Amino acid sequence: ASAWPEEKNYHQPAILNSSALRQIAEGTSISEMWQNDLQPLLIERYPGSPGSYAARQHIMQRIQRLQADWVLEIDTFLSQTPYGYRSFSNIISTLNPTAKRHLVLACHYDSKYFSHWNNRVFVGATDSAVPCAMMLELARALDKKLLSLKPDLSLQLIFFDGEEAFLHWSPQDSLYGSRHLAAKMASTPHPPGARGTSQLHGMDLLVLLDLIGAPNPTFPNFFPNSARWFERLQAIEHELHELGLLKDHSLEGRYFQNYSYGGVIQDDHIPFLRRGVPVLHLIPSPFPEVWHTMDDNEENLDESTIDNLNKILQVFVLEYLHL
Amino acid sequence: ASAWPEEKNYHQPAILNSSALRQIAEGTSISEMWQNDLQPLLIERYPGSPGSYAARQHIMQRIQRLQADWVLEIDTFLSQTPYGYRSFSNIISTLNPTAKRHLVLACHYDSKYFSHWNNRVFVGATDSAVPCAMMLELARALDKKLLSLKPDLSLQLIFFDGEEAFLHWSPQDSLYGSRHLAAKMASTPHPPGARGTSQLHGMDLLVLLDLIGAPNPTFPNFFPNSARWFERLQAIEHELHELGLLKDHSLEGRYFQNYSYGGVIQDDHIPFLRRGVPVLHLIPSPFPEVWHTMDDNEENLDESTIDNLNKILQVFVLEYLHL
Amino acid sequence: ASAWPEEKNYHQPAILNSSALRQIAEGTSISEMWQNDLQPLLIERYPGSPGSYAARQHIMQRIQRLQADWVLEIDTFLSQTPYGYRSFSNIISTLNPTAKRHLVLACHYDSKYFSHWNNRVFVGATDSAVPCAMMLELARALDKKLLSLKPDLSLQLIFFDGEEAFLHWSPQDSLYGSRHLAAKMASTPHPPGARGTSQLHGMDLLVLLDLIGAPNPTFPNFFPNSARWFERLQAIEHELHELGLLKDHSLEGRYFQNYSYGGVIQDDHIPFLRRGVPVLHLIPSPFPEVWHTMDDNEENLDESTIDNLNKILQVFVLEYLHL
Amino acid sequence: ASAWPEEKNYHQPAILNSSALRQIAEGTSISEMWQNDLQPLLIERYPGSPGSYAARQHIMQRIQRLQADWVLEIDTFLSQTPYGYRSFSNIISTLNPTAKRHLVLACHYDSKYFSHWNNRVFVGATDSAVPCAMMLELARALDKKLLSLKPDLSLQLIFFDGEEAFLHWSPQDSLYGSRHLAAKMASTPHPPGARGTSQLHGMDLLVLLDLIGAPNPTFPNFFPNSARWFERLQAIEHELHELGLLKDHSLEGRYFQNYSYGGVIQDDHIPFLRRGVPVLHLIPSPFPEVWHTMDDNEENLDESTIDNLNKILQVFVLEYLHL
Amino acid sequence: ASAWPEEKNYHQPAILNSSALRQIAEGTSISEMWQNDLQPLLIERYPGSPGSYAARQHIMQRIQRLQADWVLEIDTFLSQTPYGYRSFSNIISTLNPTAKRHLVLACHYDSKYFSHWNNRVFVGATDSAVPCAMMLELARALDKKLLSLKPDLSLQLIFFDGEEAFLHWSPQDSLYGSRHLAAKMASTPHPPGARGTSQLHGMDLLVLLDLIGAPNPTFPNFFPNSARWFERLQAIEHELHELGLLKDHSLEGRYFQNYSYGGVIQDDHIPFLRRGVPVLHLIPSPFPEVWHTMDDNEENLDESTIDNLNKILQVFVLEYLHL
Numbered sequence A, B, C, D, E: 001a002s003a004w005p006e007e008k009n010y011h012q013p014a015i016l017n018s019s020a021l022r023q024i025a026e027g028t029s030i031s032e033m034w035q036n037d038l039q040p041l042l043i044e045r046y047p048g049s050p051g052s053y054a055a056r057q058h059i060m061q062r063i064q065r066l067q068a069d070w071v072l073e074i075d076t077f078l079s080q081t082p083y084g085y086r087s088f089s090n091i092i093s094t095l096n097p098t099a100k101r102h103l104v105l106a107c108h109y110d111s112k113y114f115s116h117w118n119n120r121v122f123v124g125a126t127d128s129a130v131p132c133a134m135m136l137e138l139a140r141a142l143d144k145k146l147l148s149l150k151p152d153l154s155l156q157l158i159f160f161d162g163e164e165a166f167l168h169w170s171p172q173d174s175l176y177g178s179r180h181l182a183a184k185m186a187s188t189p190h191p192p193g194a195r196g197t198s199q200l201h202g203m204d205l206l207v208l209l210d211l212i213g214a215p216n217p218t219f220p221n222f223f224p225n226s227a228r229w230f231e232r233l234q235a236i237e238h239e240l241h242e243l244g245l246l247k248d249h250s251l252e253g254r255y256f257q258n259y260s261y262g263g264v265i266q267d268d269h270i271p272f273l274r275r276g277v278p279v280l281h282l283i284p285s286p287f288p289e290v291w292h293t294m295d296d297n298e299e300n301l302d303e304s305t306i307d308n309l310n311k312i313l314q315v316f317v318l319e320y321l322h323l
């Protein structure tokens, strides 16, 4: 158990400049996101459905066609549920799997099982297709900058499956994808041949996106081992603003407002947190008004707020990686 | 498994017009409740105890005497405790027990055990005699309308026994009547005949009333699968206010404030929450000042705040049941 | 000059002991107030009206009948208004008119002129009949302790006339009675014979009551030069509370919360504030909901808040005067 | 006098049902407003200038073209500035000028004077070109209904000139146009012939729109004498939200928050406030981030918000006018 | 059982008069503490390190050298970890081991484990060296009034070992020391020979200090079985300030603000709280900014604040113990 797993604790960012930041804002397109990356996912897609495979497919296509060398794996597994053994599949996409340290972005790509009602279907526009698209669009924008990876640090995306409960929310029935992936990663030497260090050691920070796409989001600072990273998002939000690069956005309505949170949301991060992974949980409090209703559709998304979180996060992420 | 277990997700209320709302508000007497439904319960009544039987008896007596078809059950049972096994007895009172779906109102009729001090005795008026009496008085004031039940939905009242620790707060030592009732219903088919679905699948909402009856309470919006039902309690409070139907009450001192709450309080709902029942926890934050002290008596209850909440709850219930 | 004009800055109260707080609390009766002091005032009573007179006479009769040596001035006077010259009548009751220094309580005994609208008349029970009676009740309950005045410091009460605009709020039309007195006072020498000091140099503190009687009031700390007396009002609420001597009260519904207030509220203090009197302005923010409507009546007064304030006010006084 | 000037104190809105409110939302077009009402006004248009005359022509045109018998004036006048006697020109558009009572909407069409700088020009998008287009867009979107006026009360719109300081904001150099009309109207008896009542007695309510157009406004409740009407804007806003009729909106970013404000803001309402007209000051606090900067332009206006406020305001007026 | 173990529920404090408050203030020297108590604890001191031993014996010499009859104990023990079985040594110092009841104060004497970075070492000044000292200095400062213990109630201190995770926070890898000592007290009868009552029955209250020493702490009121003692820490801070006995202190920066908390903090009290011991968790929220970084050094400790907290705590202990 060397010392590299503690570098995370001293990692510091490579702050960008007004000129770079300008380049970053102009290099992301919320409309190409909307059509190419997000509209394909707005379909029923609970675990094991045909939706799950169409969306699982859409995702890999969008990643497969970019220049950076993304090592997609599919992590199909079996688990009991209240309706019996079902088959889930997580999507992991790694740059430099051999890099010892990674920064991770993660969301969930299942949609909650619901029966149809008045012939509408639940599709989870904010829970969590926008997150999925955000991530996909971030690899698409930052592609040329992400070739530069050929500090030992790289980037992983993760699209978890079975996040949502099948029937009735509880530890036995939720977060099926993650730990799984947690427990699996916890028990896989890293780097290879390592002897005491798991892939979780190498997880520098896990940025979980969830419930994004409604208007007027407020993200809290949930955890102390990541507060400094949360503060970098505050600073980025503020700068992109002062340079004029955010859209319909005022500071009296920031997204990253410093406000500690009492309790804990259960979400895919809990399997990695209770293994001492640092988590930046970008889930808003309060949830959207359209949470878990058939109105979590596209009509009710805010394109401005997503373009904005996209700029911020893209920036966050290149400064993390010293790119 | 059919699709009726999800009907609840889309149930909307039958909002009363003004005329109606005055009619409900002239319909409840805090003074009747105060002396016929509540004062009988202000007695030491920890489990096993004699006021435990006396209280049980009383409660039943007051239901029995109503027109509506209230079906009473007892649910004597037995659990280990820090002072050894003891025998509890839940009261359930159901209308239309073959109705598939029910709104549940609930509270807890035991009283914490405390040795006597200075010749004083704990009777928990807010914890929870008043809630008890508020249900009784609801069953009374809306009798004639609850008749009209002969969408397949009725009402059910539960008065749990053993809410309180015997010694010291802890899972193994608390929540005796509810952890059992929730397990027992979770393993009873409903409707009778069913092959996939429990009586829990049938609980549309559990409205749990606890710690009520002190001046100036504020209840938060604890859970998002009942946020819309919370928002109706707000809407009712405002509209019953603007019509002059509430007493000693301003909107600057309202009870249902859109104030979400960090983490959780442990109470009789937990058993049901984790089995997937949506919960409206009418507990206040902060607790009353008398909480768990001899000083939690009548002399400290705001009669005016209870009248007002009777009114609110009774409207809520008529609106849920489309009465 | 001399240096008693500054004693007011160093004057400190004699705080009371639990035992004595009980006597004061037990010593006021809100029902003897409600009927003996207040209900007579719930009449139309605008300037020149016949109510102006019966309330004027009422107020005097009530004071006249106590044992302490209250000296009662009428300051009838003439001032121009939008409908022309009109006669007004300030009421001033004083103990030890030669005592160099006095603490002053004050309200306005007039009510706004509104025509009759569908058989409803305006009586201003908050604005300011209740404050009038609170003063009367204070003089009453403290009568026996107030004898003990045969620091050169006594008490004065002022019921102003003509506080309310006749037509439409403006400086030229409002505060007819306190614009007068403030200025007649600044130019009356005190004590008799003085040569560079006025009756205003002797106003230690003007405690002005306005708009009191609605539920859930909240009073700001308006001026830094009286803050410490407001801090004392806080302390007296708190302790009277901790001792069980308030009704329907909690600390989360405090009246005096040390929130400060931005701008100013014009009222009978202004003519004094602007001449350097220290003012303790007990007016709530926000105003009562019934402000300046025909619903500002007895129906919508909160008996228990008033009684709570009586006990807080009665204590602040005795403390200030060392009685 | 007569009784009628007090009518406004008892006047209640004719609340609209869901179907109505859907019609109104659908009746206004933000793009039509944008292209044909607001873009002509985004010019340098300070008093005297060619802008002011064009802007003035443009308002009249757009009014003239409508079916309701609007009565345009041009009150021109002369007043002394720090640079000497300059000529101004208010705009008044009235329906039914014998209508003894009017609800008045008003804003300011002048633009503040700035030297050109770095080849830019101040054009005052939010200050107040949008408020001018909103009032315009309301006269159009409600024309069919405003025609019904051939309670005696109609609608007047006022576009004030010279609101902005010439050199540096002082009571002498500011509000040229409103300080003028305030007086002119306070001395123009109403209705013709009257003998004690002016044109200001017949202002039920002045709704001043100022500095509207930026993301995330929050408007305070400035005056207790119009607070019942601010509440309705709260109510309207909420109901339109509940019904799907607002865009990129959340209740946690409400526009009208029951937040009362401290000290006063100087604007075109002051000449009318201190003369007794009740005012609804729809100005935001805090001001737009681009206040009095060259950056206050079309580019930084949030079309979504203005659309939402258009609808809210348009509803407010029908409800006031019983259409 | 017996009736002695409910006494905790009724204990009132012996509140100190101004005159003793001043002596207590006078009597603790922050400069003494810093030099004699705290500075020696500022070393790398994780479990089973030499620092640990150094740190461990030092504590004891500071208690050994006092005149009160403290009874040290080293409850050394072994436990499994992510790096093998290791050894841990609690420290407990009791006055009156046979006193049925005890006010316990505790903190943690380990340091997290960190590799050395840029030649820098983690010493944990807040976490929890300062609280270790504050506790020492409490006993120095209070030695003479403690001797008065030759209500059956005395004082205990506990310096837990192993609080901190070795690798990654987790119920398996944390709180070693308290989890041990909690179970061991749950399992020890007391007083000797009792047959149904354990040491934990005679923990009247557990006052846990953690993360103290940084600028501008704020401490929530975490539990209700202990709220009323928080209220006393609030009335103590108030009076000590209102008397000019605190330094660089304003009430708009109180340490104990009446803000309740949502979620929960894992710390060395958990094992006592879920066993029914009342806890006053004096951990601030938020955490120090320097938490678990190398900057948690002496340079970054607010000496004014610590001295202020020393006084509050010393008063609390005395009013509890009726000294």
Ligand SMILES: CC(=O)N1CC[C@@H](Oc2cccc3c2/C(=C/c2ccc4[nH]cnc4c2)C(=O)N3)C1
Residues within 6 Å of the ligand: A222, A223, A224, A225, A261, E127, E164, E165, E169, E210, E211, E264, E265, E266, E267, E287
């Ligand atoms: C304040 C807050 O939001 N939370 C939720 C997370 C939890 O704390 C942690 C989160 C992540 C890593 C952590 C810890 C944590 C908690 C903790 C608690 C008390 C401590 N005292 C000294 N070091 C101590 C460390 C720790 O040791 N490592 C409290």
Ligand SMILES: CC(=O)N1CC[C@@H](Oc2cccc3c2/C(=C/c2ccc4[nH]cnc4c2)C(=O)N3)C1
Residues within 6 Å of the ligand: A127, A164, A165, A169, A210, A211, A264, A265, A266, A267, A285, A286, A287, B223, B224, B225, B260
């Ligand atoms: C507003 C707020 O602050 N909170 C705390 C957690 C969450 O808890 C719940 C409570 C009751 C029923 C629930 C869930 C809940 C949580 C949850 C958390 C993260 C999610 N991401 C996508 N769907 C997700 C669902 C769920 O699925 N069903 C609400």
Ligand SMILES: CC(=O)N1CC[C@@H](Oc2cccc3c2/C(=C/c2ccc4[nH]cnc4c2)C(=O)N3)C1
Residues within 6 Å of the ligand: B127, B164, B165, B169, B210, B211, B264, B265, B266, B267, B285, B286, B287, E222, E223, E224, E225, E260, E261, E262
């Ligand atoms: C509001 C809040 O912040 N919290 C966190 C602590 C937790 O409650 C306790 C803490 C310490 C000792 C306790 C209990 C506690 C909780 C509790 C909850 C609901 C109750 N309803 C009636 N008595 C009841 C008792 C109890 O019985 N003994 C609630």
Ligand SMILES: CC(=O)N1CC[C@@H](Oc2cccc3c2/C(=C/c2ccc4[nH]cnc4c2)C(=O)N3)C1
Residues within 6 Å of the ligand: C127, C164, C165, C169, C210, C211, C264, C265, C266, C267, C285, C286, C287, D221, D222, D223, D224, D225, D260, D261
């Ligand atoms: C929001 C807020 O807190 N304030 C303070 C004064 C208020 O202004 C008014 C505005 C318009 C018309 C008004 C008055 C007003 C004020 C007022 C102040 C003290 C009073 N005491 C009794 N009636 C009284 C009437 C009055 O009579 N007519 C704004």
Ligand SMILES: CC(=O)N1CC[C@@H](Oc2cccc3c2/C(=C/c2ccc4[nH]cnc4c2)C(=O)N3)C1
Residues within 6 Å of the ligand: D127, D164, D165, D169, D210, D211, D264, D265, D266, D267, D285, D286, D287
């Ligand atoms: C931020 C805030 O909420 N406030 C209250 C009043 C405002 O006052 C000012 C203070 C200092 C310099 C100023 C002005 C000011 C006021 C002002 C007010 C209304 C306006 N509408 C359009 N331009 C306008 C200009 C101006 O022109 N120069 C501050």
